[PDB]
């Protein structure tokens, strides 16, 4: 029951600033108090500081940042702590997943997101890296990436060992990439047809038939509907509701096999207040903005927080 | 993959004006671009222009309009195009369904609505025709209708070949008519108990056991909850949510047997903006009002639009 | 088909005033007209007027009020009327349940609530009685309660004959009490996993395997999500939605075994307007505040109100 907290305030994977403030905002809202009350011990490492493709925006900053995060997280993982990586945009998942994968070769990744993030630079509509991060992590890039030389000899994630859950906003080329690489995916329609519980059980059974693999959760908060999670840069209608995302995290916690996690794309500057209702019982700051509060509750779920 | 577009801006079936603007509003919002991107070809026919019961309001206008729509739609159906009929209030479904039925004698009708629209003139609380249209289409009227003489020798729809889905606001007399005529109906409670997916599968199995019949979809947008579809005249609490209505249209598309469709009761003057989120990816006008945008997305679903 | 209406405007179980106005507000909104239209006859009894634990707030007022309610309700129950007890805060359920239990020894109680209300005075964070009422009713109090001497020789409710449904906001000590006393409980997560329909069927099968016991419903309106029921003092995120709470009441009605019911924690002063949509068809006042209107609709469900 030891968790290493890493702040990864990288905002170079997408147009906006805001996500760089997420790590410190979650601390201000009561991250430490929340971990404390759940009976976990924490070590807060602070914040990470900061032939070829020529069409990825801000790639130098991203590459340099990613090397630092990779080295820092590798060191935390070796402690056999649960490692919590708080972004930052989804670009931080590359170093997070790959560092975890080098240590846990049989890692299974649950990528929770409204989007695929599975564009490659030659298909990206935006040139924004956070929309390509999963494709990069899966070894789908065809050329070398500037400032990622340090990563060229790493073992990459395999599509068959991955499940994407909650998707609903996929680009034309992405649809082809998704089908082609044979990754396991579960759309909001699958969730509507079968329910979130059956969906995650199906995903876990598919990627971990013997229920014996370590799990990495990469949670993009925009997987959650705008009604509950307005504090995020790229919104897609018809997301996971409050009950669903909480149950999902609870089920993953109950595997007892989660070793690491990203929580990405929380943007405090975009967030809104409700606020304070009696049900906000975790030691979270009164009247906190709703997405920030949700983030802390979802982290609590992963650490074992339950209704009774 | 050819669709005929018919605009049927009839607003005489209910008190309000507004629905007469729906057809041109959906065009303005990008109907043609949406059809184009889905790989369909369209032919836009433009807009329809315009002993006995003595208690149906505006019946002359409705009767004259309906003859025109019947003749126009009959001509489009004979092309073997998919025919998309955009209202207008639900009154336009009489000529739509009956023209389709004369060509496709084994037509099965899916009537998606918060309401039954199954009043007869002697039971109607309002005298508004759009609340009687289904009863009229099913041959339940007991007397002749002024200005509907042209229709008297048509074959009418049979209750056993029809399923009503999403109902929740039914008048006292309607409850009796519904049970008496033995139509297949699936209330919002059936949907809550079994889910939208099981519900539509059950309905399709009930009316088309051999999965070999052409299907007509009559979609009243007020079947969808007010949160997602405020742009409509008669709202009923507890409607289909965004995920449900999208999944429903997707499942119907996947039968590959839909030959015609109404989209009715969209009233732009009542609609609201969100607006523009990244997930609005179809070539729909930026910041479009939400019900109009939903209408275009649901039309896209019927034309094969899917998440991946 | 006779219902006795008892108004129990007790507001001493929790900090706020407001719930004392609930009984008269529901009457103003059309309680009598609603009962009339459903084919029931009513008798409106009006409103109840008004070694030891030393740490329960306002306990004198509560104790004196409860004796009056117990005596009044006992008299109504003996008529073999369905008895509808409208609070007031949840404190009124003690006398309601116990009076019903003395007459119906095999009573089964369905406690619908976001909260457990299962604190004992030595574990209560607030000293507010409405957060202890279920624990008191179940005979879990260890010391005597001032001004409750009249109740000391009553038969108490048994945990195994009770089901709590909808819970999501439980205090640390309550979690232990819940598990220890072996009460049947169904959290919002159970509801999300299985659906409200399966959940209530499971609960009824568990507490009444032979489907032959009289049922008491204790409905705290804060079980319903804030979106639909803002008019209440203690809100918890992720509640029952509009469709779910309506279906739940419908299923309980359909047992044909409900003999009594509480509707508690409605606070008109906290309520909001929508308002008037066509679907508000029950004889409820136009533009009524939404929680009040919901309360009347849920009472109607229990009295047999259905979609068709
Ligand atoms: N696919 C998009 C957006 C990706 C969203 C990133 B996220 O998961 O928060 C891209 O940039 O490649 C495209 F539409 F712009
Ligand atoms: N049944 C009502 C309303 C019908 C709603 C039409 B719709 O489906 O949009 C009627 O007019 O017969 C009645 F309550 F007024
Ligand atoms: N458990 C609480 C609140 C109870 C809510 C009562 B209700 O069901 O409306 C208590 O007072 O014991 C605590 F957190 F303050
Ligand atoms: Mn992402
Ligand atoms: Mn995303
Ligand atoms: Mn209609
Ligand atoms: Mn309707
Ligand atoms: Mn309560
Ligand atoms: Mn409560």
Strands B41-47 and B2-8: parallel
Compute CA distances B270 → B16, B23, B226, B229, B231, whole Å: 11, 15, 11, 10, 5
3-state secondary structure of A180: helix
Can B117 be counted among the known catalytic residues?
yes
Nearest C-alpha to atom 8 of ligand 1 is from which residue? A115
Q: With an 8 Å Cβ cutoff, is B101 touching chain A?
A: no
Residue window 177-206, chain C: list those with CB within 8 Å of chain A. Answer: 178-179, 185, 187-189, 191-193, 195
CA distance A259 to A100: 8
Find the length of chain A. Answer: 308
Q: How many B/C residue pairs have CB atoms within 8 Å?
A: 54
Before A104, cis peptide (omega within 30)?
no
Nearest C-alpha to atom 3 of ligand 3 is from which residue? C131
Q: Which of C187, C195, C234 sits opposite A308 (nearest CB)?
A: C187
CA distance A93 to B18: 49
- Spell out which residues of chain B touch residue C308, defining contact as CB-CB under 8 Å: 167, 170, 174-175, 178-179, 185, 187
Contact flag C169-A308 (C-beta cutoff 8 Å): no
Query: Which DSSP string do the residues of C12-34 spell out, in sequence order?
Result: TTSS-SSGGGHHHHHHHHTHHHH
Q: Are the C-beta atoms of residues C94 and C136 closer than 8 Å to each other?
A: yes
Q: With an 8 Å Cβ cutoff, is A308 touching chain C?
A: yes
Neighbours of C209 (CB within 10 A): 9
Query: Which DSSP string do the residues of C250-304 spell out, in sequence order?
Result: HHHHHTT-EEEEEEE---GGG-------TT--SSPPTT--HHHHHHHHHHHHHTT
Which is it for the CA torsion C202, C203, C207, C213, positive or negative? negative
Alpha helices by DSSP H, B105-219: 133-137, 172-180, 188-194, 196-207
Compute CA distances C3 → C38, C40, C46, C302, whole Å: 12, 7, 13, 11
Query: What is the number of the ligand 1 atom nearest to the C-alpha of A265?
Result: 9
Beta pairing partners, A85: A6, A262
Strand runs labelled E in chain A: 2-8, 41-47, 82-87, 108-112, 162-167, 184-187, 215-220, 258-264
CA distance A55 to A119: 13
For C179, residues 6+ apart whose C-beta sits below 8 A from its C-beta are: A308
Experimental determination technique: X-ray
Q: How many A/B residue pairs have CB atoms within 8 Å?
A: 54
CA distance between the termini of chain C? 20
- Spell out which residues of chain C touch residue B237, defining contact as CB-CB under 8 Å: 242, 277, 279-280
Q: Which of A241, A279, A308 sits opposite C235 (nearest CB)?
A: A279
Measured in angstroms, the CA of C152 and the nearest CA of chain A are apart by 30
- Spell out which residues of chain A touch residue C192, defining contact as CB-CB under 8 Å: 195-197, 243-244, 247
Residue B201 tokens, joined: 């599968």
CA distance B197 to C22: 40
Can B262 be counted among the known catalytic residues?
no
φ/ψ region of B127 (left if φ > 0, alpha if ψ in -120 to 50, else beta) reads left
DSSP assignment letter at C155: P
Nearest Cα neighbor of C96 from C68, C112, C73 is C73
Tracing tokens 């009715």 back to the chain, one arrives at: B264
Nearest Cα neighbor of B165 from B88, B97, B113, B234 is B113
Q: Are the C-beta atoms of residues B6 and B85 closer than 8 Å to each other?
A: yes
C195: nearest CA partner in chain A: A195
3-state secondary structure of A183: coil
Residue C21 tokens, joined: 């106005």
CATH of C1-308, one of 3.20.20.70, 3.40.800.10, 3.30.470.20, 2.60.120.1060: 3.40.800.10
Neighbours of C166 (CB within 10 A): 30
Q: Exactly one of B222, B262, B271, B280 is catalytic; name it.
A: B222
CA distance C136 to A111: 46
Contact flag A169-B246 (C-beta cutoff 8 Å): no
Q: Are the C-beta atoms of residues A192 and B243 closer than 8 Å to each other?
A: yes
Tracing tokens 């409208």 back to the chain, one arrives at: C86
Host H or E run for residue C172: helix C172-180
Tracing tokens 């983030």 back to the chain, one arrives at: A295
Question: Please, which chains are in contact with A (at least 3 CB pairs closer than 8 A)?
Answer: B, C
Q: Are the C-beta atoms of residues C184 and C109 closer than 8 Å to each other?
A: no
Q: With an 8 Å Cβ cutoff, is A250 touching chain C?
A: yes
CA distance B108 to B111: 10
CA distance between the termini of chain B? 20
Q: Which of A114, A128, A220 to mutate to test the pocket of ligand 1 (most atoms within 8 A of CB)?
A: A128
Q: Is residue A171 part of an annotated ligand binding site?
A: yes
Torsion of CA A275, A278, A284, A290, to 10 degrees: -30
Q: Quote the Cα angle for B192-C204-A251, to 5°.
A: 60
């Amino acid at each position: 029951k030891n968790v290493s907290i890493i702040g990864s305030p990288l905002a170079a994977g997408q147009p906006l600033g805001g996500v760089q403030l997420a790590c410190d905002d979650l601390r201000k809202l009561g991250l430490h108090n929340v971990i404390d009350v759940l009976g976990w011990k924490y070590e807060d490492i602070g914040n990470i500081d900061n032939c070829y493709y020529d069409n990825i925006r801000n790639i130098k900053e991203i590459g340099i940042f990613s090397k630092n995060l990779f080295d820092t997280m590798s060191n935390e993982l070796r402690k056999k702590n649960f490692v919590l990586n708080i972004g930052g945009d989804h670009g931080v998942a590359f170093s997070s997943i790959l560092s975890s994968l080098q240590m846990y070769q049989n890692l299974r990744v649950i990528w929770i997101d409204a989007h695929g993030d599975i564009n490659i630079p030659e298909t990206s509509p935006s040139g924004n890296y956070h929309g390509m991060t999963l494709a990069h992590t899966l070894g789908l890039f065809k050329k070398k990436v500037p400032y990622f030389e340090w990563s060229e000899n790493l073992t990459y994630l395999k599509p068959e060992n991955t499940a994407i859950i909650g998707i609903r906003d996929i680009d034309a080329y992405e649809k082809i990439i998704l089908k082609k690489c044979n990754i396991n995916y579960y759309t909001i329609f699958d969730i509507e047809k079968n329910g979130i519980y059956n969906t995650i059980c199906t995903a876990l059974e598919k990627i971990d038939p013997n229920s014996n693999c370590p799990i990495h959760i990469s949670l993009d908060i925009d997987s959650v509907d705008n009604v509950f999670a307005p504090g995020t840069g790229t919104v897609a209608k018809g997301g996971l509701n409050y009950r669903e995302i909480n149950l999902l995290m609870k089920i993953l916690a109950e595997t007892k096999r989660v070793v690491s996690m990203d929580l990405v794309e929380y943007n405090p500057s975009l967030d809104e207040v409700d606020k304070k209702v009696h049900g906000d019982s975790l030691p979270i700051l009164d009247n906190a903005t709703k997405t920030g509060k949700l983030c802390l509750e979802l982290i609590a779920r992963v650490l074992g927080y339950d209704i009774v």
